């Protein structure tokens, strides 16, 4: 009915964001109303008497759950059902409750995780939790997988004494907290020998579906609390329904009506327009090195390459650059001839002034021109720093498309902040497929808010955050507005080349007031509001127009000779013909080109033999 509410999730680990209040107030803004944490759940540095009641709505965490350095007394992760474990903390655990004690040895006391029943991947770790009560009685053998049971390290202590006892109804005295409600619900180690996975009870008539996470309301595939793999609407599938099925009888391939595409951990009817559609029937973010991206056909697909594929450049934060957090002087070597960035771009201040922790030298601003070959970026573009001696985002003047298959914090596909630039300068940017645009903290930016960003967007609800850019009427005071040859569409700068659409016409990459018809140095013509030069062999017409096309075929009068339909500079004299016979011509009265006599081998200055003397 109501698709769960999702939050990105933090990834700071033991890092503290500002003062205890700051850190808390941020923890609140990220997980307020959240029901599904796509990333990590990191509750740290929460002090006494703070209200963590908003953490009751979290039902599932895809990454890991880190709870460390908290003096707060109670953490209400009660409605938490499952921890996927897509990532581990310290490369071993999907759940880490560490050093939660006060100076007076009195910190976290109650952790009512009475609904945490499944932990798909990773192990568990409890340590230095003096006030922790009841959790010491949890038979984790049910919650955790047996594959990780070995890597599990945890020991409790009761240096508080004020811990209560488990309600008798609690199985083997196992309970997360007080009351009969906080009894550990076992759905793993209490099942018939013929139970594939989890169950509701002990009787074999209570076996849950093979694709159920914690527990189930019924035996069937659609009676799951949480899917174990994918989610096909009502039901939990192991594999999204193939677009095509093999026909054992005809030994061929048939189309599957029940077919769905694979988007993350869900099965959809179609892929987001900004993603890549495979023949398999799954939405991916990039093709193998065996393919490129062929559009048309409606969507973005993957077709193989005629020979050696173009060089694919993994963006910052993926593959070879999973750890590198910004384009630095070290990893910049691998961005030489890139026309497409299959990932993200991070231009951080740490790259310019060098980083002594990752042992990388400062970046030479002259080396950012390397990116002038980059035509499109699949992920997002984050620019938190940029050379001061430069007044323009020059390196990306050829940037045409930002797909936004991945966004900063999962929201922004284009972020230009805290810069000394005077003008964006993205005169090639034609589409921002998805994600939001944020251009703020820019003192000297005056052309930002003039662009109609809605035109550039491609998905529903794409927002645009352009604030704190001194000069709405201050810029106009310094005469830093769009040129006179810039259509109301806006402009990426002052120069006529910095226009989105033109007022009248254009000379390639620049707008102009009128094409060079009648006069001018180069004769031109008009089509689609563009000025194209007439073939050099077009006589400069001081009266009317000069030509009606690019080729010498559309001239009103030739400048020299005329070889039939075409306007030539000099009549042919050695052009290959039929039967390997050369071709020689001559100019008569009206400068018309006519074939010479077959005999004339050294050409001819007149018709027939009477034209080529000896």
């Amino acid at each position: 009915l109501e698709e769960k509410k999702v939050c990105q999730g933090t990834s700071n680990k033991l890092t503290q964001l500002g003062t205890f209040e700051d850190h808390f107030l941020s923890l609140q803004r990220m997980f307020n109303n959240c029901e599904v944490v796509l990333g990590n759940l990191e509750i740290t540095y929460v002090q006494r008497n703070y209200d963590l009641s908003f953490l009751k709505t979290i039902q599932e965490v895809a990454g890991y759950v880190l709870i460390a350095l908290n003096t707060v007394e109670r953490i209400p992760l009660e409605n938490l059902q499952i921890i996927r474990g897509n990532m581990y903390y310290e490369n071993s655990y999907a759940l880490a409750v560490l050093s939660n004690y006060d100076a007076n040895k009195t910190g976290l006391k109650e952790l009512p995780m009475r609904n945490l029943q499944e932990i798909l991947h990773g192990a568990v770790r409890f340590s230095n939790n003096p006030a922790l009560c009841n959790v010491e009685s949890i038979q984790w053998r049910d919650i955790v997988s047996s594959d990780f049971l070995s890597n599990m390290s945890m020991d409790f202590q009761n240096h508080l004494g004020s811990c209560q006892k488990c309600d008798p109804s609690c199985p083997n005295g196992s309970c997360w907290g007080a009351g009969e409600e906080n009894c550990q619900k076992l759905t793993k180690i209490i099942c018939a020998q013929q139970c594939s996975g989890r169950c509701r009870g002990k009787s074999p008539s209570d076996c849950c579906h093979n694709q159920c996470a914690a527990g189930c309301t019924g035996p069937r595939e659609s009676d799951c609390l949480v899917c174990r793999k994918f989610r096909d609407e009502a039901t939990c599938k192991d594999t999204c329904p193939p677009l095509m099925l093999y026909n054992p009888t005809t030994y061929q391939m048939d189309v599957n009506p029940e077919g769905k595409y694979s988007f993350g951990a869900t099965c959809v009817k179609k892929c987001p327009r900004n993603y890549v559609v495979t023949d398999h029937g799954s939405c991916v973010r990039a093709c193998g090195a065996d393919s490129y991206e062929m559009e048309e056909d409606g969507v973005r697909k993957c077709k193989k390459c005629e020979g050696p594929c173009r060089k694919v450049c993994n963006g910052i934060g993926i593959g070879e650059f999973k750890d590198s957090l910004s384009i630095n002087a070290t990893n910049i070597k691998h961005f030489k001839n890139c026309t497409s960035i299959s990932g993200d771009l991070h231009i951080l201040p740490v790259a310019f002034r060098g980083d002594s922790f990752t042992h990388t030298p400062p970046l030479d601003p002259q080396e950012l021109d390397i990116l002038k070959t980059v035509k499109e970026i699949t992920g997002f573009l984050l620019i938190q720093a940029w050379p001061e001696n430069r007044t323009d985002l020059h390196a990306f003047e050829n940037l045409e498309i930002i797909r936004g298959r991945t966004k900063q914090h999962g929201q922004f596909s284009l972020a230009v902040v805290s810069l000394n630039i005077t003008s964006l300068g993205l005169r090639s940017l034609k589409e921002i497929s998805d994600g939001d645009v944020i251009i703020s903290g820019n003192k000297n930016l005056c052309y930002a808010n003039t662009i109609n960003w809605k035109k550039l967007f491609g998905t529903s609800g794409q927002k645009t955050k352009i604030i704190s850019n001194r000069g709405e009427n201050s810029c106009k005071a310094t005469g830093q507005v769009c040129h006179a040859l810039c259509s109301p569409e806006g402009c990426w700068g002052p120069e006529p080349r910095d226009c989105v659409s033109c007022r009248n016409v254009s000379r390639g990459r620049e707008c102009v007031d009128k094409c060079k018809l009648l006069e001018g140095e180069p004769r031109e013509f008009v089509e689609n509001s563009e000025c194209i030069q007439c073939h050099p062999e077009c006589l400069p017409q001081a009266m009317n127009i000069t030509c009606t096309g690019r080729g010498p075929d559309n001239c009103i009068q030739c400048a020299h000779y005329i070889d039939g339909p075409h306007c030539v500079k000099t009549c042919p004299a050695g052009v290959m013909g039929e039967n390997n016979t050369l071709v020689w011509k001559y100019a008569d009265a009206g400068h018309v080109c006519h074939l010479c006599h077959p005999n004339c081998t050294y050409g001819c200055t007149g018709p027939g033999l009477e034209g080529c003397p000896t």
Binding site: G18, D355, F357, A415
Partner: protein, 47 residues
């Protein structure tokens, strides 16, 4: 007061700090900058 190794470890004027409770090192980022090293400006708020 972190080791000469973690010198310049916390970005955007974040301050390094030793967590003796866990025997680890972490950053105390300034308001507005997130990440394990305060490397990202929290775009989804102001400026």
């Amino acid at each position: 007061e972190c080791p000469l190794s973690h010198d310049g470890y916390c970005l955007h004027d974040g301050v390094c700090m030793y967590i003796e409770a866990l025997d680890k090192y972490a950053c105390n980022c300034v308001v507005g900058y997130i990440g394990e090293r305060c490397q990202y400006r929290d775009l989804k708020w102001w400026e």
